């Protein structure tokens, strides 16, 4: 959740910097590191609104019923059945080729209308929701970068959270023993959340997708029948119906079937949005923080060095990703000790080249001893006391 | 089925014409009329092949099962589960973001493939058939134009049929008592019936359409998984599957759902082809006939005129459509009599202007006495003996 996340920046300062101003986008993480304070990771974990507002619904499959055909003789009048008074029904008026051998009198064209009742099928609804900047929640998380951490989904009593609305952006956070990071987070959505919609389908028992963040323009002009929250019936039922020509005095009525394919066509390469029932997640957004570290303290520098021998390599210094070396160690002897780390560049043994992200590495009780250092390029030798390993830097 | 059909031509001759050469397209009708013979209607009723050849099938909805995920550590190797040996299965290879907190060792990208089994759903097949000129059947129908007929779907022992293959186009036809129309019909398909296909869906209990005559090019490049007649499994299953990105070591697999809408989209305004189980109907085609009437005879001219009074109007001379006047009459007295018809143009009473399509109109037992005449333009008076009615001609 930070050595992991490919989207990792650092931020470093003069000791007499004490504000930092970042942007955090989603599921990027930043490691802030600063002279004589402990490196923190800050990151933006979640944007969402709970019970967002429902928008129009869309029919993806029509239920057609009661084909109604009424037709008049070519002088007589024009025809009507009065179900074109009603809604959630689809009606075409044609003229039918009418003679004698079709119960008429004059040879001519003999006005005809057929209507049909259009309802939507059991669970083939598609449902918008809209966001309100005033109701949305931005979640930043701080966690010290000491790596007395766990593996990628197990919390931690240092590792704290701050939740910002638009309307409240000024939390202070207690980092186990290290003191207080302050946060100030000017919220910034992305689009007009009156121009942006979470679109949902019904979970139709497959490996098929449920949900998409999508512009409110595109949604609103979709090719489908629609209503607002549980309404009478459907406007634009005719989007899903089509009529035959008239033979005689009958006129065929068709269901252009199931738009599910058609919609997921539309949505090709739109990536799916996320949802925890209540909580609707934005996929897009960022937030911009003033991270106030005038008030962190070091991991207890109050401790005596680990006996320089009793270390063994939990993890071989391995390439990190983000342009650092990281290593775990086990040190069997005494308990809470400050660790002796150092590394040096062939040529020059009397000068330490280790630039630590892991400033005052300790081995604690439960455990500890992850080290992240950045090293000059070339053949170096890394030392945790006497324990050593090679390193080449590219 | 001929005063009805908007698509009616006539053909008329010198008495010493005896061949006629027509084209008949489908569900157009021609009325041939000729000095001192009885007017016939000829027309092309049906083109079809029985049990046409099946082509590829197309899947309109996939059944996905057994998502199989296998992934390797970023030095280790590349990954395989061996279900990408198999077919009717869909496999993507990605690289997954792999670290320490994902059971690995090196920080890197750690080759992963997931496969899924793709079968097609209960009755969501789409099925071509192809035509063979050698196997197709062209049906012409002759029926005398005396209108001792019925109403638009009740046969008649005069009204005869001739069925032409490519390979046999020379029937002679016995018209009740009138003699023999000969027919010679040089068959002409339309498209290469190796470039033309009846496309079918499964009758999915709606007012939805089943069938379409369609070019074999378009069909063959459709966006769907396919097999030949009941095969192992499906090629191009991947047309209907799509994969998530890889989180960790898992990689999501999706069903782009139901192509029915998508296909009927494609087919918008293609009009539906027809099918009687065995018999597949072309919607397009025509056939070109030499109609040999050197051998028709008149309705029995052997009869005495109807008493000129005892006629009453079954149907008022009404506009036909096709540029003729048509009328029915009832004549209560004696029985088989030849009818006295005539009409005249204000100005000039001593000269008959009635040009009959209904040359030797009789009233028979069961019944009779439909008259179709064509009249010069202006105020005329039509007379069946003494019975009379006005006519204006435009």
Integer Cα distance of B279 and B50 in angstroms: 4
Determine the distance from the C-alpha atom of residue B98 to the mean position of all C-alpha atoms in its chain, rounded to a whole number: 61
Question: Among residues B133, B195, B190, which one has the least CA distance to residue B166?
Answer: B133
Looking at B80-195, which runs of residues are DSSP E strands?
A: 89-94, 97-98, 108-109, 112-120, 125-130, 137-144, 160-164, 172-175, 179-182, 185-188
Integer Cα distance of B145 and B11 in angstroms: 13
Asked if residue A137 lies in contact with residue A256, where contact means CB atoms within 8 angstroms, the answer is: no
A257 and B259: CB-CB below 8 Å?
no
Residue from the list B100, B258, B321 with its beta carbon closest to the beta carbon of A258: B258
Cβ partners under 8 Å of residue B69, min gap 6: B81, B112, B113, B114, B249, B250, B251
Q: Which two tokens stand for residue A248?
A: 């005689």
Question: Closest approach of chain B CAs to the CA of A74, in angstroms?
Answer: 12
For B206-224, the DSSP string reads SS---EEEE-HHHHHT-SS
Which residues on B lie below 8 Å from A207 (Cβ)? 64, 67, 116, 252-255
Integer Cα distance of B170 and B174 in angstroms: 14
Integer Cα distance of A344 and A352 in angstroms: 5
Question: Closest approach of chain B CAs to the CA of A168, in angstroms?
Answer: 33
Deposited resolution, Å: 3.2
Q: Report strand pairing: B179-182 vs B172-175.
A: antiparallel
B207 and A253: CB-CB below 8 Å?
yes
Integer Cα distance of A187 and A167 in angstroms: 9
DSSP one-letter code for B183: -
Q: Which two tokens stand for residue B148?
A: 């001792």
How many CB atoms are closer than 10 A to CB A100?
18
How many CB atoms are closer than 10 A to CB B99?
23
Integer Cα distance of A182 and A171 in angstroms: 6
Nearest-Cα residue of chain A relative to residue B60:
A261
Asked if residue A1 lies in contact with residue A152, where contact means CB atoms within 8 angstroms, the answer is: yes
Residue A266 to residues A214, A222, A223, A260, B264, Cα–Cα distance (Å): 11, 10, 11, 10, 16
Integer Cα distance of A59 and B150 in angstroms: 48
What is the 3-state secondary structure of B154-180?
Answer: CCCCCCEEEEECCCCCCCEEEECCCEE
Cβ partners under 8 Å of residue B150, min gap 6: B156
Integer Cα distance of A214 and A29 in angstroms: 25
Dihedral over Cα of B211, B212, B214, B219: its sign: negative
B315 and A100: CB-CB below 8 Å?
yes
Integer Cα distance of A15 and A34 in angstroms: 6
Residue from the list A101, A208, A318 with its beta carbon closest to the beta carbon of B257: A208
Q: Decide: helix, strand or coil at residue A217.
A: helix
Question: Which residues are paired to B198 by β-bridges?
Answer: B129, B213
Q: Decide: helix, strand or coil at residue B315.
A: strand
Question: Which residues are paired to A246 by β-bridges?
Answer: A251
Q: Which residue has the tokens 């323009």?
A: A217
Integer Cα distance of A318 and B238 in angstroms: 39
Which residues on A lie below 8 Å from B105 (Cβ)? 318
What is the 3-state secondary structure of B267-303?
Answer: CCCCCECCEECCEEECCCCEEEEECECCCECCCCCCC
Asked if residue B15 lies in contact with residue B127, where contact means CB atoms within 8 angstroms, the answer is: no
A253 burial (CB, 10 Å; 0-12 / 13-18 / 19+) is buried
DSSP one-letter code for B394: -
Domains in chain B, CATH or no CATH each = 8-51+132-189+280-290 (2.60.98.10), 62-120+233-258 (3.30.387.10), 311-393 (2.60.40.350)
A315 and B100: CB-CB below 8 Å?
yes
Q: Phi and psi for B264 in degrees, rounded to 5?
A: -65, -20
Asked if residue B258 lies in contact with residue B264, where contact means CB atoms within 8 angstroms, the answer is: no
Residue from the list B64, B107, B260 with its beta carbon closest to the beta carbon of A261: B260
Asked if residue A321 lies in contact with residue B107, where contact means CB atoms within 8 angstroms, the answer is: yes
Dihedral over Cα of A45, A50, A53, A57: its sign: positive
User: What is the torsion angle, in degrees rounded to the nearest 10, for the CA atoms of residue A255, residue A259, residue A262 and residue A263?
Assistant: 150
Q: Which two tokens stand for residue A273?
A: 């949005």
Integer Cα distance of B81 and B72 in angstroms: 11
Question: Which residues are paired to B247 by β-bridges?
Answer: B250
B319 and A106: CB-CB below 8 Å?
yes
How many CB atoms are closer than 10 A to CB A222?
21
Residue from the list A4, A242, A260 with its beta carbon closest to the beta carbon of B101: A4
Q: Which residue has the tokens 């001893």?
A: A369
Question: Which residues are paired to A197 by β-bridges?
Answer: A130, A214
Q: How many Cβ contacts (< 8 angstroms) between chains A and B? A: 115
Q: Rounded to 5 degrees, what angle do the CA atoms B112, B118, B124 make?
A: 150
Q: Which two tokens stand for residue A65?
A: 């019923």
Q: Which residue has the tokens 């869309």?
A: A58
Q: List helix spans (H) across chain A.
A: 216-220, 260-266
Stretch (H or E) spanning B266: helix B260-266
Cβ partners under 8 Å of residue B334, min gap 6: B304, B306, B307
A261 and B262: CB-CB below 8 Å?
yes
Cβ partners under 8 Å of residue B214, min gap 6: B196, B197, B198, B199, B267, B270
For A123-161, the DSSP string reads T-EEEEEE--GGG-EEEEEEEETT----STT---SS-EE
Dihedral over Cα of B226, B227, B229, B231: its sign: negative
Asked if residue A63 lies in contact with residue A70, where contact means CB atoms within 8 angstroms, the answer is: no
Asked if residue A259 lies in contact with residue A267, where contact means CB atoms within 8 angstroms, the answer is: no
Q: Phi and psi for B99 in degrees, rounded to 5?
A: -125, -135
Q: Decide: helix, strand or coil at residue B319.
A: strand
Integer Cα distance of A201 and A193 in angstroms: 20
B274 burial (CB, 10 Å; 0-12 / 13-18 / 19+) is middle
Which residues on B lie below 8 Å from A255 (Cβ)? 206-208
Residue from the list B206, B254, B262 with its beta carbon closest to the beta carbon of A209: B254
What are all long-range contacts of B312-320, with beta carbons under 8 Å and residues at least 24 apart?
B312/B387, B313/B387, B313/B389, B314/B369, B315/A100, B315/B370, B316/B389, B317/B382, B317/B389, B317/B391, B318/A105, B318/A106, B318/A107, B319/A106, B319/A107, B319/A108, B320/A107, B320/B3, B320/B372
Q: Phi and psi for A261 in degrees, rounded to 5?
A: -60, -40
Question: Among residues A33, A21, A22, which one has the least CA distance to residue A355?
Answer: A33
Integer Cα distance of A380 and A386 in angstroms: 15
Integer Cα distance of A185 and A191 in angstroms: 18
B318 and A260: CB-CB below 8 Å?
no
């Amino acid at each position: 959740r930070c050595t992991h996340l490919e989207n990792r920046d650092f931020v470093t300062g003069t000791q007499g910097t004490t504000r930092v101003t970042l942007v955090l986008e989603l599921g990027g993480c930043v490691t802030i590191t600063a002279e004589g304070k402990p490196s923190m990771d800050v990151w933006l974990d979640s944007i969402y609104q709970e019970n967002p507002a429902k928008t129009r619904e869309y029919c993806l499959h029509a239920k057609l019923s009661d084909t109604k055909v009424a037709a008049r003789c070519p002088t007589m009048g024009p025809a009507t059945l009065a179900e074109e008074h009603q809604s959630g029904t689809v009606c075409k008026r044609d003229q039918s080729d009418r003679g004698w051998g079709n119960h008429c009198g004059l040879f001519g064209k003999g006005s005809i209308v057929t209507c049909v009742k259009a309802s939507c099928e059991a669970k083939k609804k598609a449902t918008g929701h809209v966001y309100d900047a005033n109701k949305i929640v931005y979640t930043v998380k701080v966690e010290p970068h000491t790596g007395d951490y766990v593996a990628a989904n197990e919390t931690h009593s240092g590792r704290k959270t701050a939740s910002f609305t638009v309307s409240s952006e000024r939390t202070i956070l207690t980092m186990g023993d290290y003191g207080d990071v302050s946060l100030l987070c000017r919220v910034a959505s992305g689009v007009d959340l009156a121009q942006t919609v979470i679109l949902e389908l019904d979970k139709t028992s497959e490996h098929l997708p449920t949900a998409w963040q999508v512009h409110r323009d595109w949604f609103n002009d979709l090719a489908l029948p629609w209503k607002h929250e549980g309404a009478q019936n459907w406007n634009n039922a005719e989007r899903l119906v089509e009529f035959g020509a008239p033979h005689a005095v009958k006129m065929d009525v068709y269901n252009l079937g199931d738009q599910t394919g058609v919609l997921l066509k539309s949505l090709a390469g739109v990536p799916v949005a996320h949802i925890d029932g209540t909580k609707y997640h934005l996929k897009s957004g960022h937030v911009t923080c003033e991270v106030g570290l005038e008030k962190l303290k070091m991991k207890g520098l109050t401790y005596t060095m680990c006996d320089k021998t009793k270390f063994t390599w939990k993890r071989i210094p391995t390439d990190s990703g983000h342009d650092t070396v990281v290593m775990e160690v086990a040190f069997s002897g005494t308990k809470p000790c400050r660790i002796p780390v150092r590394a040096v560049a062939h040529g020059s043994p009397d000068v330490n080249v280790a630039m630590l992200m892991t400033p005052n590495p300790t081995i604690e009780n439960n455990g500890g001893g992850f080290i992240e250092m950045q090293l000059p390029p070339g053949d170096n030798i890394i030392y945790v006391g006497e324990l050593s390993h090679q390193w080449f830097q590219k």
